[PDB]
Amino acid sequence: EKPLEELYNVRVERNVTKDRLMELGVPRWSMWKTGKCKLPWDWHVDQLVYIEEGEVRVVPEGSQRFMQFVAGDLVRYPKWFEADLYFNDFYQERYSFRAYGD
Amino acid sequence: KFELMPPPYPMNALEPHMSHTTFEYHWGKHHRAYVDNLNKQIDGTELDGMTLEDIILITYNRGDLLPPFNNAAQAWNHQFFWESMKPSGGGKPSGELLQLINRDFGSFEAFVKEFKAAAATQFGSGWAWLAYKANRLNVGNTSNPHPTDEDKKLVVVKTPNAVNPLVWDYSPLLTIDVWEHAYYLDFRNRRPDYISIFMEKLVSWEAVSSRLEVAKAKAAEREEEEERKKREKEE
Amino acid sequence: PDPLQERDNVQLRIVNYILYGNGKPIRGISDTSIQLVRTCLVLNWNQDKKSSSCEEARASFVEIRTNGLIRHFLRINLVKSPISYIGKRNDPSGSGLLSDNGSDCTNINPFSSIYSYSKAKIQQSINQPQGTIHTLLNRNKECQSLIILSAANCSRMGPFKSLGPLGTSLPIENFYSSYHLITHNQILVTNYLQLDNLKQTFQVIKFKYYLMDENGKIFNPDPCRNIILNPFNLNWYFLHHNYCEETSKIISLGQFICENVCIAKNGPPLKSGQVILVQVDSIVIRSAKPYLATPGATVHGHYGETLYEGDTLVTFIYEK
Amino acid sequence: LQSPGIYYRSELDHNGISVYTGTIISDWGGRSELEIDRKARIWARVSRKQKISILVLSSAMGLNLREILENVCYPEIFLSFLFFQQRCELGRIGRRNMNRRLNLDIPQNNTFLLPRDILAAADHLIGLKFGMGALDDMNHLKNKRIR
Amino acid sequence: ESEEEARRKNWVDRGWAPWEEILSPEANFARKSLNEGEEVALQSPEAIEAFKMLSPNYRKKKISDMGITEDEYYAKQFEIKGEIPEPLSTMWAGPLVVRHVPPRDWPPRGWEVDKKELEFIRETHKLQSVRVDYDKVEEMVKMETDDMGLDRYKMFLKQYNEWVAANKDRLEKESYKYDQDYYPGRRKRGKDYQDGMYELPFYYPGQICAGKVTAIHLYQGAFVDIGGVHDGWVPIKRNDWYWIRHHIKVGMHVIVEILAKRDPYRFRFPIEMRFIDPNIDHLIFNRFDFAPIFHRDEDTNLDELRRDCGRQPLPRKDPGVKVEEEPLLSNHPYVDKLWQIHNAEQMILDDMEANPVKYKGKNLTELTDDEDFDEENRIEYSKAYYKKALLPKMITKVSVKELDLEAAFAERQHHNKLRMEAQERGEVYKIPKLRRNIEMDEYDFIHWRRSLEEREAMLRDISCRRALGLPLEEPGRYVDPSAFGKDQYDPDSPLYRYDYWGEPKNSEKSKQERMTDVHNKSIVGKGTVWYEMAYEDAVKERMQ
Amino acid sequence: MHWSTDVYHAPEFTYGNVHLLPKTSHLWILLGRPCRSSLVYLSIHKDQD
Amino acid sequence: VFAYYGLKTPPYKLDALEPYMSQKMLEVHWGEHHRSYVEALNKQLEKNDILYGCTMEELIKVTYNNGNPLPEFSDAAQVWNHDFFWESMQPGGGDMPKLGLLQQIEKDFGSFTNFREKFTEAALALFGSGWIWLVLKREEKRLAIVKTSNAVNPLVWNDIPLIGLDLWEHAYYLDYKNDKAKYVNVFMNHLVSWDAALGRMARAQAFVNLGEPKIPVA
Predict the structure, then answer these.
(1) Residue among B161, B184, B189 whose CB faces G128 most closely
(2) Which of E260, E253, E247, E179 is nearest to E213 (CA)?
């Protein structure tokens, strides 16, 4: 019922504004890229991700259900979060690892 | 027996904006309590006789903060903070810095508005920082393949209570005291108003340039030591 | 050789040893020349100083197939003695009995979910017991155990034959008063407060209800009297405080009833047990079976012990 | 023939309270005896001599006195109290029987008189003295094997 | 232990309570008689009466003497022995002042109503900060009516009325599907559903309400009717009921206060409450830690479930390592496809390049490995080949479309020309890297930065948390290894393993012996090792 | 197991499960299915679920 | 738009506790910091409906997220804490706990002085801005002295707070800019309400029962 995101606390902003992104140094973030691959990652600190081209399906460990991300979104994955990240096509990604505080 | 430094600037009658009374409380009272306590604790200490930087590093003690870290960090923090202030000198620092700023923040103004945000980030006692990226990776695949320039970065961090980037080895340049004792008197909880003033009316931009120079020098020394290590490995 | 490589457990080493023993020359064949020095490569897992480690390594052929052309690179992989990943990041990518099988949710691709749908379709196991979990309070200090209760165990013995939210309390100007607890406790009042108003009738007061409007004025139709406002209607009605209750309980909760006893001359509760649910026209009983022990015997068990079938309950001593 | 395993017998005692005993049949045929008297004895009866210490055998295994205490229930009673070639091999049949009688779950490939077992045996031996136990019937066919 | 102490332990710990036993005319005889002895004249007075009552006539005659109807005898059998507690008297503290505040979470998730109205509704939430004084209340009381405007509440009331209309039906259908049989606390339906029964958005915590007890359960608690589709639960359990029964009975009229509202699907008893009118707090010693839930048919992930309920994390064994210091990870997922692809492209290109017949009739831009090939179909494991040994042989299909053949062919030419000049040189051509090889490092490169960025941050967090007095690892994910106990141990510390005394341990299991057998074949002479080297060291020696 | 009355509350000897009886009593065995639980289970299997 | 909103005046007059505390210190604390705290929350709340509808207790607890506070944690925690602080102080001070709390204090922590000593000492230690509290622990059924850095209240770990003090600098600076010991000593000796605590114990007794069951003899 509740979307999976709320349960797992991955807060997202959809279709982020250019002005908003003007703030927060969205530009100059480190970049990542992939084609078709699956990654198992456990985040030990929070990540702020501005995906752009990349599309990712996150299946929380054990789930038979997934969270799908497309276009321009900014997702803050939680500390201690463990999930599997699966992508079938081109990926772009900007990443800042925000520790406590910002 | 660490230095109870008399304040570097005239201090008392130095600035109209900062009260002499406020100064008396900040330096006269806090330092004195810190230093005697630091001294008291360091009585019979093998640690005694080390540098302040050494004692701070030592008692932070990595994962577990040990008993003496708090006192020392603050003593050092207070005087380092002191260095940043100027008798009415501020604005548009230029030199290596201006070149560095546009490289990162993109404008001196941009850095200023970015630094201004720190007022919000502390949420309590602490110190905001401007720092250098001479950072030692301590484990595993520590070395950087394709090692290249721009590795250097001018970084701004937020530290709660007793924290100095030395603990994580980022070279500190400038500091502000967000701990209420420092600004409460002149403005009662108006941290936004106090901040910009510090940013413009009283910060020795040149002291920060000197510090930047010192940091560049230290980084160079470190790379030289690395080259020495490489030579030893070759031989 | 690659610029970026990551530390790995496997330790490849090469051992070159002399062919023959020193001081003894073997005969040399005219056709084939002797090999003075030889070399070999060995694969040994890295071993911790504290615990010796023996390599567990197997090689299986793998092929890259393109237009029926085979790349004969058989990878050799080392299976770690530790069963599982410390962390998902460090995890082996594949952890399944069969790579081909798509039954596992992890095995099903995120991109194509057909295998996952098939797994979802399969029904849950019927092995489980379908009931309320009853936890043993007795075993709480020790390892706890569970009893699962169901219909087989509990049965409905007897077929047999104005109200709502009054409001929310308003915060208090005189905090020091003990008025904040809405009602007092007859036994525990003494510790909080000396009983000055105990002498007064209806304690401090009987029910006294006053409704406050959004504006701030208190409107009660009769201040001394108790009247209430029902929310939906918005009219005013009394609460039947007296309640008109005249109920006598023939069977009370927790009583144990033996067989062949009659509550009335109808419907004998033919089941021993403890009443566990009393409702208006029914009672539910959990089954029990009685056992008699004469003085001089032994009961093997503590009060809330779980006895499985076949376990001795009592021992009697008889004189032949 | 009798199967390898641990068997508990209660020998009625000539004086006062009855003695209890355990025994370990093996493929070799060596039998291992442990006994508890009215005063807790936990004494091996393998030696013709009356007293041999089961605890000493546990110490021979390198177990700490402290380690033993943590492992055994009924610690106080044992506190108050303060080969390999033949007997120590138990066949697969021998191991399974041991695991069933004294609940243990050492895996089947293991086929040895590992020390934990000896401790468990002592623990059961005292439980009988307090009433919590079963004395075995050796004529039952669960205890016999066919060649 | 004295009996007095033991009786305590059994009550507090193991649940003992001396409940009543209703027995047959014959069982009573049994309990009283056996005390005396065997085959002996019964002397105790109680026994003699028990003998006489095994006869039906004596019982009826005796009851008539007691002057009660037949029904009365039956009732006295079910009576409560022991001390009978005094009745409990209600003491009210001070007056009650209340306002009908609209439920805070009015919107049921998913119903949209006009915003301005909502804003109006939520104004009231602000008004509760005011403080009024009880003593002067009497004076302000206007017995008069018609001057009260609960406009905000009234607006909410209209709003709700619409809501009920829309989903009454949906709500009954949903219950039937997910709840088979009614138990107290679940939606009333059918003959049960009289209209006017309040629904769930109406109730919010903190409300004071009026009700009647409809049920008592020994292992769960009292159930009260508050005028709504769902009943309310006051939690009382087990031994406590021994005394509480004398004070809470079915059909009593009680006053209660809501302390929680929860979802019907996950939580068994939706509304939790406490008794206000009869204060029974002295008596409730045993309590529920977490509220009861339904483990429904659909859920497969325990972890997802823990989150919806509120329960602590499932435990895992604690890991010895501190990840404050651990090696960085420098490998890339997409790399797998590439090493598989760079070779794949080259292998197809090489086949055409090496053979003139293959080259003829072949177009670099477009080629097909097979007309019907499917990569998914190709994946397989085959043990048939026994050339070196019989073992699985995987097959991976490279989509012809995927391969960048034309680019490879162009690259190969430059490479073969280089090879041809090398042939003129007479020195075998060696190529250190190909662009594809360079790419491998490039895709790989981003990862080094990933670890770094994180690790650095982590360092920053460790310290931030360590000074802020916050939690380092999940509260509850990791538990002491020792606490889980009695697991079989490979080590000899729990003695699970066997150390050796007077022991051959002839069961090497060919752990080294089988390996030695293979060694002997390779190296029949037991030669001293003239040279030993690591592969990496050897590569370094070749480079330098 | 349940005994309302007539069984000595105190275990007979220091370390065992034997309780003796002063006068004649009935011991009741109440019926339910006994299942066994891991520490893992105990966290998500709670009372009255 | 706002719930858990509103500024609730302190129960006492703003300048009522004059000898011990200046009107100034009180006026500023309620007037500026507290008011700011409330307003902030309200706006933060407007955005998400789901968190609008939560018990205060629940809101503080939901937001903590087992150690990763969500963005809204601070405002709520601080408003609740400040409101609590106001119930703790009174138009007077307490020589000692009366009635039941005395029996408890004696049992769990020595004698009243013995307790004070632990209390004063613990108080000295906190480094930075934090609050100190006296609480009841549900599971172990004993009173305890607990110290939390920054915002965190003792509600987050399911304990029931009886009294609480603000060790944040703004609270004690105006009068004694650097006399820490003074604010502490005065409060305990002269500016705390024992009565309020006893009253709070009373509601607590519904949730945790301290006492012994009547065990029937049979």
Answers:
(1) B161
(2) E253
